[PDB]
Amino acid sequence: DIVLTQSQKFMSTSVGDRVSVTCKASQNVDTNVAWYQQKPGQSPKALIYSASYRYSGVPDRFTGSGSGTDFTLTISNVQSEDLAEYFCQQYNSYPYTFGGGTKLEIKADAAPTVSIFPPSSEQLTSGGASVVCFLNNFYPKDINVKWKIDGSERQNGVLNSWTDQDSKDSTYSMSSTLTLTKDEYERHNSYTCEATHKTSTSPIVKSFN
Amino acid sequence: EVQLQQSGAELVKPGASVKLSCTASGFNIKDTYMHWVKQRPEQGLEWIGRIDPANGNSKYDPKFQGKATITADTSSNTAYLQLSSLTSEDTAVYYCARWDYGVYWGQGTTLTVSSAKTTPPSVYPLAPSMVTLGCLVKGYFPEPVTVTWNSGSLSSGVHTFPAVLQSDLYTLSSSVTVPSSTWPSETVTCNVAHPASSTKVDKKIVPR
Amino acid sequence: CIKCDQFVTDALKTFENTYLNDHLPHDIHKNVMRMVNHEVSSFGVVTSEDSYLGAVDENTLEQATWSFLKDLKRITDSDLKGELFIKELLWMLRHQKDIFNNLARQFQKEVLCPNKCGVMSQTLIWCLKCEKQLHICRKSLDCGERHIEVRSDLLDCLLSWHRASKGLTDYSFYRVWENSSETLIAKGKEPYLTKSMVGPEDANYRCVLDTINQGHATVIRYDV
Ligand SMILES: [Cl-]
C-alpha cells in the first residue's frame, strides 16, 4: 500500500490569508492524486482531480499542484465557509489510499480556564468515583494534562476528549476525567490537575481534598 | 440533479452481517463505477472497493476482501455493500460514491457493532467572577444523548464534550459557565435526554 | 498544431457524439470534452526555452495527426469506464503532447532551415492560431566561388536544399566579363549547365536562383 502522509496534522490560518495543504507519497504517484473537502458530519466533496484539474462547482480560489511524490493543495483566499478538513487521495495503483487529514482552523490566543470537580454523593453511593477536570476556551489545541494523586503522577484511568473549534469563540475545550474505583478513591487525600500548555510558561493547577 | 441516498443507520451484534444499500438518481448506475469508503475518527478514510453494475465485477482493498462484498442491482439503480463476520473494528461511517469525472457521495451510513444492551445514562451533578458547573453522564448505550441546561434557556457558555466509550458504554459530560452572582442565587438544573431508551433525567446542581 | 488538422477536428466530434456514451454517463460529456479540447489546443503553443515547438511543417503535422488518431482509437476501443476512463484519457492527451513535442524538436533539429547558404522559404503551420505562412531563412546569398577546370564540356549550381525550398521557379545565370558586364548565358528549370565543344575563349561566371516574391534565392560565382 502507498502511504500518503500529510505532515501538518492541522494548521492554523487567518480569515484572509492563503493556506497550502501538503501530502507526501511513499512511492511515485505520477499525477494521480485527488483532493477532498469534508466538513464535520457530512460526506466529503471532491475538489481537484489529477493534482491540478479542478471540477466545475469548486471555486477558483482552490488550486492544486505537485507531481511524482510531493503534492500541495493551496487555497488562495480563504473564507469562513472553507474551514474544514482536507484529504489527498492517490489512485495511481491499487489499493487506493487516503492518508491523514488536515483541518484549516483559524489562529487565536487564549489561556484555558481550568476547573476541578470532586465526585459527588450520588456517584459515591453507586460504587464509583470519577474526578473530572475541565479546560475551556483555549486556542492551541495541543495541550497536555497530567493527573497527580498525592503528588505522584497517575498513568491509568484517565480518558479525555476535545470539542470542535467553537465558531463563535474560535477556541477549543478539553475535559480529562480519571475513572477510579470507589475504594481506591478515599485511600488518597490529594488530587490535582497538572495541565501543561503553550499559553503559559508555568502550568495552571487546581486541586482539592 | 444527481443524488445518492443510501441506507439508514444500522446497529448490530458482533458476528452478524449487514447489507447497507445505496440508491442512485440522475444517472444510470450501469454507465459508471461505484465505490465504497469507510471513515473512522481515529484511522481516517479507507478505500474498500468498487463495482461496475454493467459487468458485475468488483475490485477490493485486499485487507477488506474477507469482509466486504460490493454488489449492485442494475435495474434498481442500487449499489449494496455487505459486511460479514462483523467485529467492533467495523464501527464506522460507510460512504458510497460515484466516480467518473466527478465524485458524488451519499449521506453516509453509520454502522455500530457492539454486543451492548440498551442502558439509560446515570447522570451525576458536578459542583465546585464566574463559576463553572457541570453534570457527568455515564454508562449509556446507544448514542446519542441530548444534554441541555435549564430547559435550554442557559444556551450560551456551554460546550458538551463528545462521548468516550469505556468498556462498551458511552460516557460524556457538559460544562456551563455562569456569573457567580447568578449561582446559587438562581438554581441551575442539568437536563439529559437519551431517546434510545426513551428516558430523561434532570439533576439540580446543588452547591457542595 | 493538431487542432488545425481536419482529421483531428472531425475525430473529436465523432468521439463526443458516438463513443462517449460507451464510457461516460451523459451528464458530463460536455464537461469532459472541454477538458479534452483545452489539452489539444495547447499543442505546440510556445509557452515559457521551448521556442522550437511554435510551428511545424506539413510533414510533421501529419505524423502527429496519425499518431493522435491511433491513440484516440485506442481509448474508444477499450471498455474501461469510470475513474479509470478519465485517467487513461488524460494520460493519453499528455502522451501525445510529448510525442508531438519530440516531432517539433526533431523538426527544428534537422529540417528547419537546413540551408548552409542563401535564402530558403519553407511552408510552416503555426499552432496557436492555425495560420500557415511562408517562413524565410536568411543566410548570405554569397555561396562562395567554384574553380572548375575543363578543351574538347564545361557548371553545377544546385544545392542539396534547393529541391526542398518553395517559390523557386527557374534559375538564370550569366557570364561576368572582365568589363564587369553580365550576359545571360541561359535561363531554365535545369539546375546545371553544359556547353559542348569548349574552347580557350571561355576563360568568370555567376549563378542566380530566383524566387517568386522573395528575391534571389542563391548566387554562386565560378572561375573556369
Ligand atoms: Cl455522516
DSSP, collapsed to helix, strand or coil, labels residue A67 as strand
CB neighbourhood size of B104 (10 A): 22
CB contacts of C82 in chain B (<8 Å) are 32-33, 50, 52, 99-100
The sheet carrying A158-162 orders its strands as A113-117, A128-138, A172-181, A158-162
Evaluate the omega torsion of the peptide bond into residue B144 and state whether it is cis, within 30 degrees of 0. Answer: yes
- Name the residue type at position C217: A
Could you tell me if A100 and A117 lie in one domain? no
**B87 close to B113: Cβ distance less than 8 angstroms:** yes
- Residue for grid cell 553545377: C156
**Distance, CA C12 to ligand 1 centroid (Å)?**
41
**CATH assignment at residue A121:** 2.60.40.10
Q: Cis link prior to B14 (omega < 30° from 0)? A: no
Cα dist from B106 to A133, B25, B96, C81, C117, whole Å: 39, 11, 6, 21, 70
Regarding whether C166 and C96 lie in a shared domain, the answer is no
**Chain C, 118-177: which have a CB under 8 Å from a chain B CB?**
none
Reference A117, options A99, A96, A132, A136; nearest CA is A132
Q: Tell whether C20 and C106 lie within a shared domain.
A: yes
Closest residue of chain A to C90, computed from CA coordinates: A50
The residue from A37, A72, A106 where one domain ends is A106
Distance B115 CA to ligand 1 centre (A): 22
Are both C156 and C72 inside the same structural domain?
Answer: no
- Contact between B33 and C82 under an 8 Å Cβ cutoff? The reply is yes
- Rounded Cα–Cα distance for residues A22 and C134 (Å): 49
Determination approach: X-ray
For C219, other C-beta atoms within 10 Å of its C-beta total 19
Beta strands in chain B (DSSP E): 3-6, 10-12, 18-20, 22-25, 34-40, 44-52, 57-60, 68-73, 78-83, 92-99, 103-105, 109-113, 122-126, 130-140, 146-149, 164-165, 170-179, 189-194, 199-204
Burial (CB < 10 A; 0-12, 13-18, 19+), residue A189, is exposed
**C-alpha neighbours within 13 Å on the C-beta side of residue A150:** 6
B99: nearest CA partner in chain C:
C83
CA distances from A163 to A89, A135, A170, B142, B162 (A): 27, 10, 12, 20, 7
> Alpha-carbon distance A192 to A190, whole Å?
7
Q: Residue B132 in contact with residue A115, Cβ under 8 Å?
A: yes
**Pairs across A and C, CB distance < 8 A:** 9
Q: Which amino acid is at A97?
A: T
Residue whose cell numbers read 501538518: A8
Does residue C106 share a domain with residue C8?
yes
Residue among B47, B160, B162 whose CB faces A97 most closely: B47
Residue B68 CB neighbour total at 10 angstroms: 20
Cα separation values, C48 from A66, A107, C44, C53, C101, Å: 19, 38, 12, 11, 14
Are C82 and C165 within one domain? no
Domain shared by A140 and A98, yes or no: no
Subunits adjacent to chain C (3 or more Cβ pairs under 8 Å): A, B
Phi and psi, residue A105, nearest 5°: -85, 165
| A193 class by beta-carbon count within 10 Å (0-12 exposed, 13-18 middle, 19+ buried) | buried
Q: Which of A117, A126, A163 sits opposite B122 (nearest CB)?
A: A126
Specify whether A44 is located in the same domain as A119. no
Determine, yes or no, domain membership for C125. no
- A141 HSE (CA, 13 A, CB side): 17
Cα separation, C93 vs C106, whole angstroms: 20
Q: Which of C47, C45, C46, C50 is nearest to C2 (CA)?
A: C45
Number of domains, chain C = 2
- C6 and C105 both lie in a single domain: yes
Q: Which among B35, B45, B123, B160 is the top mutation candidate for probing chain A, defined by the most A β-carbons within 10 Å of its own β-carbon?
A: B45
Contacts of C156 by beta carbon, 8 Å cutoff, 6+ apart:
C146, C191, C192, C193
CA dihedral (C114, C120, C125, C128) positive or negative: positive
Looking at the fold, whether A83 and A154 belong to one and the same domain comes out as: no
Which residue type does C50 have?
D
SS3 A92: coil
DSSP state of C101: H
Domain boundaries, chain B: 3-113, 122-204
How far CA B55 is from CA of A95, B103, C4, C135, in Å, comes to 21, 21, 39, 55
Kindly report the CATH number that applies to the domain delimited by B3-113.
Answer: 2.60.40.10
Question: C112 with C122: CB under 8 angstroms?
Answer: yes
> Residue A117, SS3?
strand
C98: part of which helix (H) or strand (E)? helix C83-110
Closest C-alpha among A151, A173, A152 to residue A162: A173
Residues C106 and C146 in one domain: no
Contact A189, A150 (CB under 8 A): yes
Q: C207 and chain B: CB distance < 8 Å anywhere?
A: no
Domain that holds residue A102: 4-106
Residue C167: its H or E element: none
Beta-ladder partners of C185: none
What are the beta bridge partners of residue B174?
B135
Q: Mutating which of A29, A31, A36, A58 best tests the C interface, going by the most C Cβ atoms within 10 A?
A: A31
Beta strand residue intervals within chain C, DSSP E: 55-57, 120-126, 131-137, 142-146, 168-176, 182-188, 205-211, 216-222
Same domain, C36 and C86: yes
Query: Domain total for chain A?
Result: 2
How many Cβ atoms are within 10 Å of B66's Cβ, its own excluded?
10
Partners of C87 on chain A (C-beta within 8 Å) are: 32, 50, 91
* Structural domain containing residue C190: 142-222
Contact C83 B102 (CB under 8 A): no
Task: Tell me how far apart the alpha carbons of residues A6 and A33 are, in angstroms, rounded to a whole number.
Answer: 13
How far from each other are the two terminal CA atoms of chain C, in whole angstroms? 49
Residues B80, B81, B85, B86: is their CA dihedral positive or negative?
A: negative
Any domain includes C116: no
Q: Answer whether A94 sits within 8 Å of B138, measured CB to CB.
A: no
Alpha-carbon torsion angle A183, A184, A185, A188, nearest 10: 120
C120 found inside a domain: no
Taking the C-alpha atoms of C125, C127, C128 and C130 in order, what is their torsion angle to the nearest 10 degrees? 50
Domain assignment present for residue C201? The answer is yes
Nearest-CB residue to A91 (from C31, C35, C83): C83
Please report the DSSP string for B121-171 in residue order. PEEEEE---EEEEEEEEEEEBSS--EEEEGGGT--TTB-PPPPEESSS-EE
Classified as helix, coil or strand, C221 is: strand
> In chain C, which among 40-99 make CB contacts under 8 A with chain A?
83, 86-87, 90
**C83 and B33 in contact by Cβ < 8 A?**
yes
Kindly state the cell numbers that stand for A30: 505520477
User: Which of C31, C87, C90 lies closest to A56 in CB terms?
Assistant: C31
Test the A interface: residue of C24, C80, C87 with most A CBs within 10 Å: C87
Taking CB atoms and an 8 Å limit, are A130 and B138 in contact across chains?
yes
Burial of residue B202, with CB atoms counted within 10 A of its CB: 0-12 exposed, 13-18 middle, 19 or more buried: middle
**Looking at the complex, does the CB of residue C82 fall below 8 Å from at least one CB of chain B?**
yes
Counting Cα atoms < 13 Å in the Cβ hemisphere of A65 gives 4
Domain C-terminal end among A81, A106, A131: A106
Answer with the one of A75, A91, A106 that is the final residue of a domain.
A106
Residue C86 and residue C23 share a domain: yes
Q: Is B98 helix (H, G, I), strand (E, B) or coil?
A: strand
Q: Say which CATH topology domain B122-204 has.
A: Immunoglobulin-like (2.60.40)
Amino acid at C88: E
Residues whose CB falls within 8 Å of the CB of residue C184, separated by 6 or more in sequence, listed in order: C172, C173, C174
- Interface size between B and C, measured as CB pairs under 8 A: 39
Q: B187 — phi, psi (to 5°)?
A: -70, 140
Residue C126 lies in a domain: no
CB contacts, 8 Å: B52 with chain C: 81-82
